[PDB]
Amino acid sequence: NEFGIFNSLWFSLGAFMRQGCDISPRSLSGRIVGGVWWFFTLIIISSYTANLAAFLTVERMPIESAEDLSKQTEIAYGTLDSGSTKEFFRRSKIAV
Amino acid sequence: PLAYEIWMCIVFAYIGVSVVLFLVSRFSPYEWNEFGIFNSLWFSLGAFMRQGCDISPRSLSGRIVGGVWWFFTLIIISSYTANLAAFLTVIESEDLSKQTEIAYGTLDSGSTKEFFRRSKIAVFDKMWTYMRSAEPSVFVRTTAEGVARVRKSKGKYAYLLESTMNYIEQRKPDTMKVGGNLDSKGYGIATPKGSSLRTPVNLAVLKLSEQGVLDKLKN
Amino acid sequence: KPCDMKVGGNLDSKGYGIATPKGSSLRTPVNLAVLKLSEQGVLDKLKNKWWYDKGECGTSALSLSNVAGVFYILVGGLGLAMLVALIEFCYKSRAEAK
Amino acid sequence: NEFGIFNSLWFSLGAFMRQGCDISPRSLSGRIVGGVWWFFTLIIISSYT
Amino acid sequence: KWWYDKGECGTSALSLSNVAGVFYILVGGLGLAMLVALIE
Amino acid sequence: DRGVQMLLTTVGAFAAFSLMTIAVGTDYWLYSRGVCKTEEVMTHSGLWRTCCLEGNFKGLCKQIDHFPDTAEYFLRAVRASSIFPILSVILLFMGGLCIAASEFYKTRHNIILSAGIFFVSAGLSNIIGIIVYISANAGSYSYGWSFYFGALSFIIAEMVGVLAVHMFIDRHKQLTA
Amino acid sequence: EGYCVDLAAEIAKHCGFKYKLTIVGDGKYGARDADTKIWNGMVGELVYGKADIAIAPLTITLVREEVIDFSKPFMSLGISIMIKKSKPGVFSFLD
Ligand SMILES: CCCCCCCC/C=C/CCCCCCCC(=O)OC[C@H](O)CO
Ligand SMILES: CCCCCCCC/C=C/CCCCCCCC(=O)OC[C@H](O)CO
Ligand SMILES: CCCCCCCC/C=C\CCCCCCCC(=O)OC[C@H](O)CO
Ligand SMILES: CCCCCCCCCCCCCCCC(=O)O
């Protein structure tokens, strides 16, 4: 019924899982520690759920195009040395 | 938000946690812990719904069981809410041939109707076998008639027409082109066999092609 | 194999054709044969035969795979709890004065 | 105390605001009512957020 | 010669940097609690 | 009401053991749509043999090829050798054996506790086996009556464990009098 | 063996001729050298009369159609990009 080391650990774990308490501090110092741990828990668990929602929402909605190839130079690119592909590029009037 | 298997295994884990909490809480004669099997089940249910506790295990082992059940509950309920937030925030082809709820047809006289009447491809021959015998007729006298039939049939009529016309997708109000093209071909300027205009018009089409006129006009 | 991808749309649209010397006698029969093979579906069968028949590379809810780890932890914790309880019970049962 | 009409209204309101308990039903019937109310609260509050 | 011969330039997870403040508040609260207990 | 409790626990142990053994031996765990012995047709796949039906040569079937990142290797190994379903079968067998021996060498009232522990452990092994099975399947479908025989064996095993622990508690309560 | 080997046999049957497959000596499709103005590849073989027909993935292009004849397309295509290229982790709930 009082905060020994094992009961202190149980209170902290239960406060983190938002799983209620069978006992809470009664003194000013115990209540300062409890309140600050409750704040830390609220921010951390809200942030876990918010970031998991962000992960799933973004997942629900490195070259993707010729424009991509044209704008970069880390990735080399070419064609058959003799072919209609090489001629397509040698004569294209399209900017990209 | 959660797959059927997650719900089923949540129920199995609930039964297992309740039984192991009951066993560990009251099995040794030296403990004789108000966790009977009924109270173990109540504690586990109220822990899962993130609701009041009213009793918490006091032993080391009952506390291990309680702690892992609390962690499991936090992860599973957080993920249910996150995936529901994801859900709230944000005929494909052969498909026509394999079904009958959605009717489908072509222009009553066209290269499309002839494509199907002569196809030796199984899916298209199956579609032709259906379309030529469908009643009421799935064929339309004009493209506009086919478009209106799609628009007024509440999704129960799909229309087969050339990709180019399927233009209608960019017109007010409700239609969409789905899947790839069933074939590949081209439109040509036609003249009577042996016409004097054949050569100049063939060369002009190539000149208009090369100078970009045909792309400007389609755009 | 090793199946290690086509990206983006096609840059243009064109076709492969059977070619003959300018003015060849074979030009008309071969043009008509290509159209016969096209109309009878031979060209589709042959592309499928050589591209896909012998190809060596061929939901929204949350699946049990996404959370299986939490189930493994839960059952491991239940096992550890049972072991701790039995260890303490054996200790107490052996600690009675004899 | 036990669940009179005033205490039962308080129990239900506290359950909906996810604000834990001072008492909880002890009998099988009370616990069935409490269980379905807890499930209802969880789905409705998760869906609101 | 004038451009390149003389060239002089040759949904992630959440990091401890955007929750650090709450850790600082937590440890400050633990220090304040210890001080209040010792004063009493 | 002691006496009928012993019959109920013995019947439950035998039922759980039989159900879990049938589930492991039988192969209607998953109604997938794949290839029978080496056309895509339905199949009553199981823990060992992916077996065919509604096909050109239905009824002829083979041994599933489990194998084609150590985590995937470990999971594929644990799901290839059904160690967890088989361990569930063994633990249910030993639990039943303890319950049976609870009539001979009576007055120990400490082996019936071992029976309860064996039944609870069998349930836990069974649930791990279901999780690894479903996880490895993710490498349309449905689940067959073999899957539900395994699940029902889990439920009956947990109930029989609760009864065994209750009987052990009652026995020490009588002894303490 | 191949798509064009299968197609060659069928074109030959439907046109009624016997044929001999030959691999283009320079292994090229066909381009007019800007400089020597000589056509190489399969197009050159047809232009200079070394071959009577080309049955290959030979693209119908304006510059080629000016010097050789092409049937209607037996295959439709376009230039594309080829690039060198998931199971969730068990403890992915910590991500
Ligand atoms: C007195 C209190 C009694 C004790 C109460 C116990 C309950 C708390 C357990 C929490 C889960 C612990 C396990 C966390 C999972 C660890 C897995 C991990 O670290 O994964 C590694 C990963 O692969 C990258 O390295
Ligand atoms: C110890 C006292 C016990 C207290 C008991 C409290 C009950 C708590 C749970 C209630 C929800 C259970 C009902 C869930 C119904 C699921 C609906 C369903 O079955 O899904 C339909 C179908 O599968 C898809 O189309
Ligand atoms: C009855 C006894 C209870 C005892 C009390 C328990 C503690 C209360 C809980 C949390 C305190 C949180 C403190 C928040 C600190 C805010 C820091 C801040 O605001 O700094 C940001 C800055 O203003 C931007 O520029
Ligand atoms: C803590 C234990 C009980 C918690 C409530 C869990 C609800 C169980 C539902 C099980 C069946 C779910 C069926 C969904 C799949 C489907 O719609 O096809």
Author numbering:
A (entry chain A): 569 to 629, 632 to 666
B (entry chain D): 520 to 551, 569 to 626, 633 to 635, 637 to 709, 711 to 717, 719 to 764
C (entry chain A): 716 to 719, 721 to 774, 784 to 823
D (entry chain C): 569 to 617
E (entry chain B): 765 to 774, 784 to 813
F (entry chain E): 5 to 42, 55 to 84, 92 to 162, 173 to 210
G (entry chain A): 422 to 506, 510 to 519
In the authors' words:
The Phe231 to alanine mutation, which destabilizes this interface, slowed desensitization recovery of GluA2(F231A), both in the absence and presence of TARPs (γ2 and γ3). NTD and LBD changes contributed additively: the R/G-unedited (Arg743) isoform harbouring a mutated B/D NTD interface (Phe231Ala) recovered the slowest. A desensitized GluA2(F231A) structure unedited at the R/G site (Arg743) exhibited more separation of the LBD dimers and an approximately 10% increase of non-swapped receptors relative to the edited Gly743 isoform, approaching GluA1. This suggests that the re-assembly of desensitized A/D LBDs is attenuated by Arg743 through charge repulsion, resulting in a greater proportion of A/B LBD dimers, and thus non-swapped receptors. Closer analysis of the three sets of desensitized structures reveals a gradual transition of the LBD tier into four-fold symmetry, which is greatest for GluA1 and smallest for the edited GluA2 mutant: GluA1 > GluA2(F231A)-Arg743 > GluA2(F231A)-Gly743. Hence, communication between the NTD tier and electrostatics at the R/G site in the LBD orchestrates AMPAR desensitization recovery.
